[PDB]
Design an enzyme around this catalytic site. Structure first.
Site, PDB file in Angstrom:
ATOM      1  N   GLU A  73       1.131 -12.613   2.496  1.00 25.67           N
ATOM      2  CA  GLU A  73       1.968 -11.672   1.736  1.00 25.67           C
ATOM      3  C   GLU A  73       3.047 -11.036   2.631  1.00 25.67           C
ATOM      4  OE1 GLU A  73      -0.744  -7.590   1.701  1.00 25.67           O
ATOM      5  OE2 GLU A  73      -1.663  -9.497   1.046  1.00 25.67           O
ATOM      6  N   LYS A  78       0.822  -1.210   0.000  1.00 17.07           N
ATOM      7  CA  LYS A  78       0.000   0.000   0.000  1.00 17.07           C
ATOM      8  C   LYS A  78       0.861   1.267   0.000  1.00 17.07           C
ATOM      9  N   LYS A  98      13.059  -0.859   1.123  1.00 15.14           N
ATOM     10  CA  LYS A  98      11.630  -0.563   1.149  1.00 15.14           C
ATOM     11  C   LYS A  98      11.425   0.957   1.089  1.00 15.14           C
ATOM     12  CE  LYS A  98       7.421  -1.422   4.038  1.00 15.14           C
ATOM     13  NZ  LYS A  98       6.743  -2.359   5.029  1.00 15.14           N
ATOM     14  N   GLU A 113      16.815  -7.090   5.412  1.00  9.83           N
ATOM     15  CA  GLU A 113      17.320  -8.388   4.956  1.00  9.83           C
ATOM     16  C   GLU A 113      16.561  -8.845   3.699  1.00  9.83           C
ATOM     17  OE1 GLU A 113      16.725 -11.454   7.930  1.00  9.83           O
ATOM     18  OE2 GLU A 113      17.144 -13.103   6.508  1.00  9.83           O
ATOM     19  N   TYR A 114      17.293  -9.300   2.681  1.00  5.66           N
ATOM     20  CA  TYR A 114      16.689  -9.818   1.447  1.00  5.66           C
ATOM     21  C   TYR A 114      16.279 -11.295   1.611  1.00  5.66           C
ATOM     22  CZ  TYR A 114      17.103 -12.026  -3.308  1.00  5.66           C
ATOM     23  OH  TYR A 114      16.937 -12.783  -4.440  1.00  5.66           O
ATOM     24  N   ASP A 137      -0.730  -8.375  12.008  1.00  4.82           N
ATOM     25  CA  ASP A 137      -0.952  -8.332  10.547  1.00  4.82           C
ATOM     26  C   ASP A 137      -0.304  -9.542   9.864  1.00  4.82           C
ATOM     27  OD1 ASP A 137      -1.982  -7.298   8.153  1.00  4.82           O
ATOM     28  OD2 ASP A 137      -0.250  -5.976   7.795  1.00  4.82           O
ATOM     29  N   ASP A 165       7.108  -7.152   7.835  1.00  5.85           N
ATOM     30  CA  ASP A 165       6.100  -6.073   7.808  1.00  5.85           C
ATOM     31  C   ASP A 165       5.495  -5.785   9.179  1.00  5.85           C
ATOM     32  OD1 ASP A 165       4.276  -4.140   7.180  1.00  5.85           O
ATOM     33  OD2 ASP A 165       3.177  -5.300   5.668  1.00  5.85           O
TER      34      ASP A 165
HETATM   35  N1  LIG Z   1      13.029  -8.267   2.439  1.00  6.69           N
HETATM   36  C1  LIG Z   1      12.296  -8.640   1.345  1.00  6.69           C
HETATM   37  N2  LIG Z   1      12.745  -9.572   0.470  1.00  6.69           N
HETATM   38  C2  LIG Z   1      12.007  -9.943  -0.606  1.00  6.69           C
HETATM   39  N3  LIG Z   1      10.781  -9.446  -0.903  1.00  6.69           N
HETATM   40  C3  LIG Z   1      10.214  -8.511  -0.087  1.00  6.69           C
HETATM   41  C4  LIG Z   1      10.950  -8.072   1.105  1.00  6.69           C
HETATM   42  N4  LIG Z   1      10.174  -7.169   1.738  1.00  6.69           N
HETATM   43  C5  LIG Z   1       9.049  -7.032   1.009  1.00  6.69           C
HETATM   44  N5  LIG Z   1       9.058  -7.841  -0.070  1.00  6.69           N
HETATM   45  C6  LIG Z   1       7.950  -7.926  -1.069  1.00  6.69           C
HETATM   46  O1  LIG Z   1       7.289  -6.664  -1.124  1.00  6.69           O
HETATM   47  C7  LIG Z   1       5.939  -6.759  -0.637  1.00  6.69           C
HETATM   48  C8  LIG Z   1       5.589  -5.554   0.247  1.00  6.69           C
HETATM   49  O2  LIG Z   1       6.439  -5.484   1.417  1.00  6.69           O
HETATM   50  P1  LIG Z   1       5.831  -4.966   2.846  1.00  6.69           P
HETATM   51  O3  LIG Z   1       7.031  -4.757   3.719  1.00  6.69           O
HETATM   52  O4  LIG Z   1       4.859  -6.026   3.305  1.00  6.69           O
HETATM   53  O5  LIG Z   1       5.061  -3.613   2.426  1.00  6.69           O
HETATM   54  P2  LIG Z   1       3.642  -3.014   2.994  1.00  6.69           P
HETATM   55  O6  LIG Z   1       3.994  -2.406   4.308  1.00  6.69           O
HETATM   56  O7  LIG Z   1       3.280  -1.938   2.005  1.00  6.69           O
HETATM   57  O8  LIG Z   1       2.713  -4.206   3.019  1.00  6.69           O
HETATM   58  C9  LIG Z   1       5.897  -8.062   0.131  1.00  6.69           C
HETATM   59  O9  LIG Z   1       4.564  -8.609   0.230  1.00  6.69           O
HETATM   60  C10 LIG Z   1       6.871  -8.916  -0.657  1.00  6.69           C
HETATM   61  O10 LIG Z   1       6.214  -9.364  -1.862  1.00  6.69           O
HETATM   62 MG   LIG Z   2       3.138  -1.804   6.098  1.00  3.96          MG
HETATM   63 MG   LIG Z   3       2.821  -6.094   3.796  1.00  8.04          MG
END
Ligand SMILES: Nc1ncnc2c1ncn2[C@@H]1O[C@H](COP(=O)(O)OP(=O)(O)O)[C@@H](O)[C@H]1O
Ligand SMILES: [Mg+2]
Ligand SMILES: [Mg+2]
Ligand SMILES: CCOc1ccc2nc(C)sc2c1
Ligand SMILES: [Cl-]
Ligand SMILES: [Cl-]
Ligand SMILES: [Cl-]
Length: 265
Positions: free
Chosen positions: A134, A17, A36, A85-86, A130, A148
């Site tokens: 995803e 979002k 991010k 972290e990836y 949460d 997240d």
């Molecule tokens: N450290 C990471 N490594 C690989 N993919 C990631 C990582 N962090 C996020 N993603 C991808 O990006 C999407 C959004 O990250 P997220 O931190 O959940 O954002 P939001 O707070 O907007 O939900 C995740 O659902 C995943 O698909």
């Molecule tokens: Mg968030």
């Molecule tokens: Mg998320």
């Protein structure tokens, strides 16, 4: 300290979002990580600065193999950047849509990993609030990692922020805007266990209004193929009264988990 100039940016890893997440490499060390990116205009509009501060503060001090690391953050005139972290094997969400359903061994192993991570969080009175596919990522050996932490808090708590999207993983006390505690994550763990085995969450419906109805009345049924052990565990977690939901040690020691999981507590 860190700034954008320090990283080479690569392919999009996913979208949220507010979050737009990219693969990146730090230039002098060649360290591979995930960046991010959040837009300040959007953060200020939605009034969620406090959520981001909690995300950074809470997640950066946690240290557990099944929780995603946050290393730091920086920002410029238009954007905030979180250094993460990836997770090289992607999301549990993507895996579920590839396979449709998980078998009993895969499900129980994910549940064990989740309960280990959550037990560590709850020992600091941190609740995630949460937990959903995803936001569950996979490491290089396929191990589950919780990510997240934007909705995470210290129990006990109310809610001062508008519920954005799906109600599907939230307990009755949370959607009714009532008072809540650590037991919210145990309800979500139940929803996930069902969704892993069946392919969809147990209160799913075509409208918000009706999903709200199914959740508040705990109206769910099981397809024929769900076994008696799985039914027992899920039925124990999806209890309307939070104080009736089991402790995480009970989840980790449930006979169905111990029979099918390939990892220990
Ligand atoms: N450290 C990471 N490594 C690989 N993919 C990631 C990582 N962090 C996020 N993603 C991808 O990006 C999407 C959004 O990250 P997220 O931190 O959940 O954002 P939001 O707070 O907007 O939900 C995740 O659902 C995943 O698909
Ligand atoms: Mg968030
Ligand atoms: Mg998320
Ligand atoms: C942990 C630091 O959190 C921050 C830092 C900068 C910032 N700018 C905003 C508009 S919201 C916000 C949150
Ligand atoms: Cl509050
Ligand atoms: Cl809140
Ligand atoms: Cl426990």
């Amino acid at each position: 300290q860190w700034a954008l100039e320090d990283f080479e940016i690569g392919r999009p890893l996913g979208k949220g979002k507010f979050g737009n997440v990219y693969l990146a490499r730090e230039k002098q060390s060649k360290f591979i990580l995930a960046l991010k990116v959040l837009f300040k205009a959007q953060l200020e509009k939605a009034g969620v600065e406090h959520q981001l501060r909690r995300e950074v503060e809470i997640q950066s001090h946690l240290r557990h193999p099944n929780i995603l690391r946050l290393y730091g953050y920086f920002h410029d005139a238009t954007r905030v950047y979180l250094i993460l972290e990836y997770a090289p094997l992607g999301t549990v969400y993507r895996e579920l849509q590839k396979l449709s359903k998980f078998d009993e061994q895969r499900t129980a192993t994910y549940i064990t990993e989740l309960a280990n991570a959550l037990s560590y969080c709850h020992s600091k009175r941190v609740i995630h609030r949460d937990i959903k596919p995803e936001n569950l990522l996979l490491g290089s050996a396929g191990e589950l990692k919780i990510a997240d932490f934007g909705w995470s808090v210290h129990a006990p708590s109310s809610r001062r922020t508008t519920l954005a999207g799906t109600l599907d993983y939230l307990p009755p006390e949370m959607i009714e805007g009532r008072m809540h505690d650590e037991k919210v994550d145990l309800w979500s763990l139940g929803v996930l266990c069902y969704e892993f085995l069946v392919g969809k969450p147990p209160f799913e419906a075509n409208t918000y209004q009706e999903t709200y109805k199914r959740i508040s009345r705990v109206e769910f049924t099981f397809p024929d193929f769900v076994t008696e052990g799985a039914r027992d565990l899920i039925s124990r977690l999806l209890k309307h009264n939070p104080s009736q939901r089991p402790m995480l040690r009970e989840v980790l020691e449930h006979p169905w988990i111990t029979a099918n999981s390939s990892k220990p507590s």
